[PDB]
Amino acid sequence: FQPEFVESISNVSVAVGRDATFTCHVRHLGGYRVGWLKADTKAIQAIHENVITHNPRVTVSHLDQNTWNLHIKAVSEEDRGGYMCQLNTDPMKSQIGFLDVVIPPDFISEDTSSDVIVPEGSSVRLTCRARGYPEPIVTWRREDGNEIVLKDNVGTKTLAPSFRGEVLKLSKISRNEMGSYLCIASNGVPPSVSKRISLSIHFHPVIQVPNQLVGAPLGTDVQIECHVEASPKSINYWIKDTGEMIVTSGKYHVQESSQSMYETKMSMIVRKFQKDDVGSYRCIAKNSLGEVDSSIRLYEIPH
Amino acid sequence: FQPEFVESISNVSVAVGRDATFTCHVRHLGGYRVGWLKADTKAIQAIHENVITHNPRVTVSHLDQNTWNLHIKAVSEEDRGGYMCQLNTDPMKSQIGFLDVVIPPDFISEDTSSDVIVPEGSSVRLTCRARGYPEPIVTWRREDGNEIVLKDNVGTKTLAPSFRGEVLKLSKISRNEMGSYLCIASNGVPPSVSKRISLSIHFHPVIQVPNQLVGAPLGTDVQIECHVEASPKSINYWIKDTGEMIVTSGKYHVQESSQSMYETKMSMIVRKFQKDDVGSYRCIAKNSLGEVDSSIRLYEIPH
Numbered sequence: 292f293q294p295e296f297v298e299s300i301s302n303v304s305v306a307v308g309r310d311a312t313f314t315c316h317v318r319h320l321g322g323y324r325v326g327w328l329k330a331d332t333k334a335i336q337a338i339h340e341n342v343i344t345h346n347p348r349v350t351v352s353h354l355d356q357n358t359w360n361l362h363i364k365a366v367s368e369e370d371r372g373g374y375m376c377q378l379n380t381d382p383m384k385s386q387i388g389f390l391d392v393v394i395p396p397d398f399i400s401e402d403t404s405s406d407v408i409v410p411e412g413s414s415v416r417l418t419c420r421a422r423g424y425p426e427p428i429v430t431w432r433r434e435d436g437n438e439i440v441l442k443d444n445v446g447t448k449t450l451a452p453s454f455r456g457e458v459l460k461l462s463k464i465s466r467n468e469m470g471s472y473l474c475i476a477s478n479g480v481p482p483s484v485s486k487r488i489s490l491s492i493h494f495h496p497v498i499q500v501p502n503q504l505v506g507a508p509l510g511t512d513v514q515i516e517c518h519v520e521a522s523p524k525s526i527n528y529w530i531k532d533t534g535e536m537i538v539t540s541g542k543y544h545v546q547e548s549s550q551s552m553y554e555t556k557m558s559m560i561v562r563k564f565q566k567d568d569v570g571s572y573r574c575i576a577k578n579s580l581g582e583v584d585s586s587i588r589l590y591e592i593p594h
Numbered sequence: 595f596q597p598e599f600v601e602s603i604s605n606v607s608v609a610v611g612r613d614a615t616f617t618c619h620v621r622h623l624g625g626y627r628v629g630w631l632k633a634d635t636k637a638i639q640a641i642h643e644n645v646i647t648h649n650p651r652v653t654v655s656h657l658d659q660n661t662w663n664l665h666i667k668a669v670s671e672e673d674r675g676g677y678m679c680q681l682n683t684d685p686m687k688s689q690i691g692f693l694d695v696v697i698p699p700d701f702i703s704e705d706t707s708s709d710v711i712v713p714e715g716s717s718v719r720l721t722c723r724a725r726g727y728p729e730p731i732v733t734w735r736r737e738d739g740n741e742i743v744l745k746d747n748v749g750t751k752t753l754a755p756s757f758r759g760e761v762l763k764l765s766k767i768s769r770n771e772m773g774s775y776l777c778i779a780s781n782g783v784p785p786s787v788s789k790r791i792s793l794s795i796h797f798h799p800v801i802q803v804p805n806q807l808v809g810a811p812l813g814t815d816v817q818i819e820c821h822v823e824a825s826p827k828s829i830n831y832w833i834k835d836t837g838e839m840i841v842t843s844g845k846y847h848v849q850e851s852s853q854s855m856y857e858t859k860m861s862m863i864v865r866k867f868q869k870d871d872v873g874s875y876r877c878i879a880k881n882s883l884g885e886v887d888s889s890i891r892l893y894e895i896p897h
C-alpha cells in the first residue's frame with residue numbers, strides 16, 4: 292500500500308492571541324514522513340517530529356502514525372494564510388488548510404474627534420474610525436439616552452436613538468443637541484471599543500423673570516423667581532438692593548433647579564415680610580462668557 | 595550575527611538525462627539549517643543533510659557551513675521549475691533558482707509522411723513534425739543533392755537547395771522532382787533526427803528511336819540504339835525478328851545506360867554484318883505498369 296489520507300484538515304478562524312491547530316488524518320503511513328510548511332511564504336515549518344522554523348509559537352505533536360497536528364500558540368496577523376501538510380511520497384501528496392485571523396477593533400486616534408465647542412445654529416461633523424478584521428461598524432448614541440437629530444436637505448429632519456456610520460453629521464445645531472455623544476466600534480470580535488465625545492454649545496446667560504413686581508402683605512412669605520438659560524452652567528446668587536448677597540438663613544431661603552444642562556430655575560423666599568424688606572432684589576447669573584442681572588421689585592400691600 | 599548569503603545561486607539549462615546542481619553561498623550559518631524544496635509543487639526536497647523526497651535522483655552535499663548543494667541526477671521534464679534553498683530563520687530567507695530542461699527533437703510519427711506515389715503533373719504535400727524544446731525547425735533537402743522546385747501563384751517558380759518548414763509543398767510535379775527527400779528536425783539539442791521520404795512518379799515506358807533504319811556494309815559493326823523513358827525503371831532486352839532474345843556474345847554486344855532514375859539508353863552492336871543478319875530487331879522495355887516495343891530495320895549496303 293501507499294500512504295493516503297482521509298477527511299482532510301479544514302479551515303480555521305481564531306482571532307489574535309488565541310491558539311490554533313491543524314490536523315491531517317493519514318492511513319498506512321509506513322516509513323514516510325509528514326511535514327508542514329507555510330503556504331504563502333513557502334517556509335518549511337516542520338517535518339515529522341522535528342521543528343524547522345524558529346518561530347517559537349509553532350509546535351508539532353502526534354499520538355500515533357495516523358493523526359499529525361501543527362500548533363500555533365497565540366496567533367498573530369503574520370500567521371494567517373495556508374498551512375500544508377505533505378507526505379514525502381514520489382510524487383508528494385498534500386492537504387492544505389487556511390488560518391483566518393480576525394482582529395478586534397482599535398480606534399484610529401488621528402481620525403477620531405476630540406471635544407468640540409460649536410456655535411449654536413451651525414453644522415458639525417463627528418468622526419470615529421477604527422481598524423479591524425472584519426470591517427468594524429461605528430454606531431453613535433447619546434450618553435444620556437435621548438435621540439439624535441437626523442436632518443437631510445434643509446426641510447426634512449427626524450429623530451433616532453442611534454446612527455450607524457463613521458461620521459455623524461449634525462446640521463443646524465440647537466441648544467438641545469449639546470451633551471456627550473458615544474461612538475462604539477464593533478466587528479463582532481471582543482472587545483468592542485467606545486469613546487465619549489462632548490459636543491458643547493455656549494452662549495451668554497439669559498434671564499427671564501415672570502412677575503418682576505410682587506406684592507406682599509406684611510408678615511407673609513413671598514417667593515420671587517428667575518429663569519436662567521446659560522451655557523456653560525452659570526454660578527447664580529441673589530443680592531440686596533444695597534449690595535449684599537442673600538444666602539439661605541432663618542429669614543431667606545435660596546434654591547436652584549436644573550431642567551437641563553443649560554436651564555436653571557433659581558428662586559428666593561423671604562419670610563415674614565416687613566417694612567424693612569421693601570425694595571428691589573437682583574438675581575445674578577455668571578458663567579465664563581459673561582454675567583447678567585435682572586431686578587424684581589417687592590412692595591407692600593397696605594393695611 | 596544572523597545567517598546571510600551572497601552571490602545567489604543562478605538559473606541552469608541542462609537537457610534531459612544530464613545531471614544538474616544548485617548551490618547557495620551562505621555566511622555565518624551558525625546553528626540554522628539550509629533546506630531545499632521544489633518551488634512549483636512546494637514539495638520539500640531536503641533539509642540540511644537529510645533527504646525528504648523519495649525522488650531517487652535528488653541528493654544533497656556540502657563541504658563546509660558555507661556552500662550547500664542540491665543535485666538532480668539525469669534530469670527529466672518533471673524536474674524543471676524552481677528550486678529554493680531557505681534558511682530556517684524567523685522570518686525565513688531564501689534564494690530561488692530555475693532548472694530549464696531542453697529536450698531533443700522527436701518525430702510525431704502520425705504526422706510524418708510515408709512514401710508517396712503521385713501522378714505526374716499534380717500537387718503533393720510532404721509533412722514532417724517533431725516535438726521538442728525549444729521549438730524544432732524542419733528543413734527539407736533532396737537526398738541526391740539537387741535543388742527543390744519552389745513554386746507560388748501559378749506563374750512564378752524558383753529553385754533552392756533546401757526548404758524550411760514542416761510542410762513541403764510541391765505543386766505541378768514533373769518527372770525530374772522524383773526521388774528521395776530528407777526532412778531533418780533540429781532544435782539545437784543533439785541529436786537531430788531525420789527521415790527519408792520517397793516521392794515516386796510512375797508512367798508507362800516510352801521508347802524513342804533515332805534512326806529506325808540503319809545501313810550496314812557486309813563485314814562491318816553496326817550499333818542500333820533505343821532511348822527508354824520509364825518509371826519505375828524498366829527491364830529491357832533486344833529480340834530477333836523470329837523471336838529469339840539477344841544477349842552479349844561474340845556476335846552481339848548489348849548495353850544499357852541510365853542518365854537518371856527514369857531514363858535508359860539501351861544499345862546493341864552486331865559485329866561483322868552478313869546476309870544472315872539482315873532484318874528487323876526489336877528493343878523491349880517492361881516495368882510494372884506495362885511493356886512496349888519498337889522495331890529497327892537493318893539492311894545491306896550492296897557491293
Ligand SMILES: *[C@@H]1O[C@H](CO[C@@H]2O[C@@H](C)[C@@H](O)[C@@H](O)[C@@H]2O)[C@@H](O[C@@H]2O[C@H](CO)[C@@H](O)[C@H](O)[C@H]2NC(C)=O)[C@H](O)[C@H]1NC(C)=O
Binds near residue numbers: 301302372387389391
Ligand atoms: C478552505 O477554504 C477554501 C477557500 O479559498 C480560501 O478562502 C479563504 C479562506 C482564504 O484563505 C483564501 O486565500 C483562499 O482562496 C476552499 O477552497 C475551495 O475548495 C474547493 C474544493 O477543494 C474548490 O473546488 C474551490 O475551487 C476552492 N475555492 C477557492 C476560492 O479556492 C477550501 O475547500 C477550504 N478547505 C476545506 C478543507 O474545506
Ligand SMILES: *[C@@H]1O[C@H](CO[C@@H]2O[C@@H](C)[C@@H](O)[C@@H](O)[C@@H]2O)[C@@H](O[C@@H]2O[C@H](CO)[C@@H](O)[C@H](O)[C@H]2NC(C)=O)[C@H](O)[C@H]1NC(C)=O
Binds near residue numbers: 602603604605690694
Ligand atoms: C532566473 O530567471 C528569472 C526569470 O524568470 C524565470 O524565467 C524562466 C527561467 C522561467 O523559469 C520562469 O518561470 C521564471 O519566471 C529571473 O527573474 C528576474 O529577476 C530579477 C531580479 O531578481 C527581477 O527584477 C525580475 O522581475 C525577474 N523576472 C521575472 C520574469 O520574474 C531571475 O533573476 C534569474 N535568477 C538569477 C539568479 O539570475
